Amino acid sequence: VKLSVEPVTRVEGHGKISVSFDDSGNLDKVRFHVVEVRGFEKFLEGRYVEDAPIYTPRICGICQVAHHLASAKAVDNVFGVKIPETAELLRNLMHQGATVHSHALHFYMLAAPDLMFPTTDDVLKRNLMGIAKEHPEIIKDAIELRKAGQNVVRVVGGRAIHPVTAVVGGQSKSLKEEERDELLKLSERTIELSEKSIEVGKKLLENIKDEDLLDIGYFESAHMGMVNNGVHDLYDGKLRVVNSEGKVEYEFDPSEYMNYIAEGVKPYSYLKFPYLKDKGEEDGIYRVNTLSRLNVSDKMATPLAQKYYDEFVKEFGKPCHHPMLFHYARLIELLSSAEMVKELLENDKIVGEDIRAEPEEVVGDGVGCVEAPRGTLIHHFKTDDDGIITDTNLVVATVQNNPAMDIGVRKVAEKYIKAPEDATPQVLNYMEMLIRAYDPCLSCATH
């Protein structure tokens, strides 16, 4: 007997789960398959390097900002140019605004329906419309957070989806004093709603704990995230890896990523299976984003976020390997980004006019790295003397949680399915809940 969950819903992209049983009727093979691929790495060859920040955002419509900036950075390295401070701040402001929208989007519109209705049969209730029908205040807040984040992206990036200001040597436009004032005034409400969101999560994760669903897909792995002097940072710093026990294994510059990360290929999925090269396919499994970043970080960069992180760390320890608590860490990050949007808007250099540095001679190698809302994002481009791309490599966030998602779904089935009858609609949804915990973006991950 062979069962298939397709398509996996309330996730970005094309994914599916297969569950096979042997002749006796016992659980046999459970796998997570990604059924999409566009081949951006190859078709970027022959393109203008300065046009990479125009093509990569099209890898994904949720985290397009992350790609725009990762490409911009790599491109700024291809040209031996160091961008001005005001440009670094505008880019980061766009990055934080984008993270608020992405985290709010996932928690409220993709994850919350399961956290609110974990044991329902009514499939039509498990969605933002069902949540809005009984708790409209929750969906209204999600929308207000998303709108605030996208507003920041639109103002600083030119477009709410697929921004265009991160150009070679910096930004194509400056933030005007009036624009800055309007955004800073709106920033306080984004922090309030982000704080409120953490509580909605506490309540809903308590409901998950009551149904013995907080340990679904559990397994221990390494964790990777960007840190700036050991402090949590989504825009700059070095990449840190902690082991399953919390010991710092590596700390390296994103440009040396090829010496630490490797991506395996399995025949049943268009999604690769990354691992730490030194440790291997099984001992080198690591996770990225939200909890993985909290785990590697010494502390948060903002004060309100730090308080919830402190409270979480004392209750669940370090490192926390619970897939379902990724939801919680996501809420702490939703708050830190909201706090950062305000912080950056309060920095007088944001409205500066020294937004661009003149491009220098072309160096045919450039690496761009940023922590996308779903994990470490690395864009690596190689070009000719003309600045035409000759080779590229993209290690995109969610690809690094594919091993976790494939192990996790197996572990849910091992916990709830012995025979095919056990695979009820609610049990099958438990498998998709483990997937959703990692906030996957399958278009992103495959590129």
């Binding site: 309330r10 999409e36 099209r58 949720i62 697929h162 200001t165």
Partner: protein, 298 residues
């Protein structure tokens, strides 16, 4: 009114633009009956009796083709949702290489990739179709919402008109109408061609008259021209007007026509092809699959 959405060879950006209606999304969802939408709900199969269907993305794999055909049979009105569905979009650049070259890079020759036996995922995953194709090449499409992604207001305007029974009408003019940049009354004249990083562009003068390849002249209005207003040329993401089949071809025609028009009879006709080192990427970023020659012969 039973409405449904699906996504193919795109990026979800059109779906996110629909969500960028924000407070208005709830007003829309109270009027319509959403029966299938992978991103927002768990209804796995496309149900029968769908009045309106929004299909995002172009045709990239065998499964995209099956879904498109299925949605066409279940829906009364099919809408090519966004530039990918309508013209093919950015993934369409994959047409410059063979499907084997796209897959060999991603699963074999990328620097970080470790593939011992050298296999391409082929189990439980669909095969790629020969070339990326706009939705209209495989199924009959009734209407389309251009844009990468289409603006939220435009999506609402189109959906609203269909719920009312009215026929949706898209803007007809090219982008310079909406662009706030100043044009020379004497007409356009291009002296040299610059890559976007070359020089420092004037914020008031039309970028095309400044030597940058701006696609606004060959691109449909509606977006509000955020790119030229932000300091970068238009990349032609909304696609061509209703009177232009091949956007890239018309853009090249216009560009070649005005290049050195003030010295029309003596200007060297080889400066332009020698200057543009990536022609397809300069004129077919978002529309290669809908072009007369939508692939590269190998």
């Amino acid at each position: 009114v039973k409405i449904a959405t699906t996504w193919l060879g795109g990026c979800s950006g059109c779906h996110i633009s629909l969500l960028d209606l924000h407070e208005e999304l709830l007003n829309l969802l109270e009027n319509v009956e959403l029966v299938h939408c992978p991103v927002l709900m768990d209804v796995k199969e496309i149900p029968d009796e769908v009045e309106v269907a929004l299909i995002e993305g172009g045709i990239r794999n065998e499964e995209n083709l099956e879904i498109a055909k299925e949605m066409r049979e279940r829906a009364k009105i099919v809408i090519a949702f966004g530039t990918c569905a309508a013209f093919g979009g950015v993934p369409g650049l994959g047409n410059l290489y063979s499907n084997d070259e796209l897959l060999d890079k991603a699963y074999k020759t990328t620097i970080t990739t470790k593939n011992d036996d050298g296999i391409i995922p082929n189990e439980e995953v669909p095969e790629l179709v020969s070339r990326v194709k706009p939705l209209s090449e495989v199924i009959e499409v009734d209407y389309f919402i251009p844009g990468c992604p289409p603006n939220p207001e435009m999506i609402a305007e189109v959906v609203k008109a269909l719920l009312e029974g009215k026929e949706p009408e898209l803007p007809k003019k090219n982008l310079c109408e909406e662009c706030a940049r100043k044009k020379s009354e004497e007409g356009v004249a291009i002296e040299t061609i610059k890559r976007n990083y070359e020089g420092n562009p004037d914020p008031e003068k039309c970028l095309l008259e400044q030597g940058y390849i701006c696609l606004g002249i060959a691109t449909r209005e509606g977006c509000g021209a955020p790119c030229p207003s932000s300091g970068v040329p238009c990349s032609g993401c909304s696609g061509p007007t209703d009177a232009v089949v091949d956007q890239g071809a018309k853009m090249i025609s216009a560009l070649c026509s005005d290049f050195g028009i003030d010295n029309d009879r003596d200007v060297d006709p080889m400066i332009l092809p020698k200057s543009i080192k990536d022609k397809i990427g300069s004129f077919y970023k978002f529309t290669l699959p809908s072009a007369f020659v939508p692939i590269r012969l190998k």
